[PDB]
């Protein structure tokens, strides 16, 4: 709907955030219209004065997920912080968690080859993999937690 | 979260394995006819 995108252009930042939440519920159906307006949602995520930055990031990450651009979807999902819940049984969350584990394992593997370049692993990506390993441990799925801990090169979580 | 995180790669690896097998078999048969 071009009515929610128009509400994002208004100076009531809170009302723009409300329009963004309205587009979030509707992100599954309205992603082809929202994709044209990604630069407006990116500008709302970059704006330091906006209290609801994590909700803008979550709408952007859902739009990139429906576009098929999982890397940018992950970068914005890491921007959403507390609004990205690992507990949610959504196809969006599963695909992004799988991609987050793969990127984390790839970065950890490279950081161990290059003894001279500490590839700066985003602490947000580490925190998602931690919560997922803890979920697998709480679910009694120890064999999966061990497989993931071996891929992630995390000896401490393997011991746990 | 283990169901949606770890087991997900089993359904992914097999899809590429199935096409790699067929491509390798086709190339191997093309080379085998010539070798024979």
């Amino acid at each position: 709907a071009g009515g929610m995108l128009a509400m994002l252009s208004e100076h009531s930042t809170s009302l723009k955030l409300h329009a963004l939440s309205n587009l979030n519920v509707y992100a599954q159906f309205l992603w082809p219209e929202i994709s044209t307006s990604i630069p407006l949602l990116e500008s709302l995520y970059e704006d330091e004065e906006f209290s609801q930055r994590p909700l803008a990031a979550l709408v952007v990450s859902k739009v990139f997920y429906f576009l098929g651009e999982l890397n940018d979807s992950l970068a914005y999902a890491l921007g959403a912080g507390s609004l990205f819940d690992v507990s949610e049984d959504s196809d969006y969350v599963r695909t992004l968690l799988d991609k987050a584990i793969d990127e984390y394992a790839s970065l950890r593997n490279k950081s161990a080859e290059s003894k001279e370049e500490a590839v700066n692993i985003d602490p947000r990506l580490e925190a998602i993999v931690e919560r997922m390993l803890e979920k697998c441990i709480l679910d009694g799925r120890y064999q999966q937690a061990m497989g993931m801990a071996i891929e992630c090169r995390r000896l401490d979580k393997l011991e746990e | 979260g283990l169901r949606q995180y770890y087991l997900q790669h089993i359904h992914e690896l097999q899809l590429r394995v199935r096409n790699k097998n067929h491509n390798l078999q086709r190339l191997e048969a093309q080379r085998n006819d010539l070798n024979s």
């Binding site: 064999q143 497989g147 | 770890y6 790669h9 089993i10 690896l13 394995v17 790699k20 190339l27 080379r31």
Partner: peptide, 30 residues
């Protein structure tokens, strides 16, 4: 065991992957 099915599947897929270079070598030597 539950994680074994994925680890073994990955091992076999990786092993079959080298088959590409294996075949390519003979495709030129032949």
């Amino acid at each position: 065991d539950l994680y074994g099915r994925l680890k073994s599947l990955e091992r076999q897929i990786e092993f079959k992957g080298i088959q590409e270079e294996y075949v390519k070598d003979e495709l030129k030597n032949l």
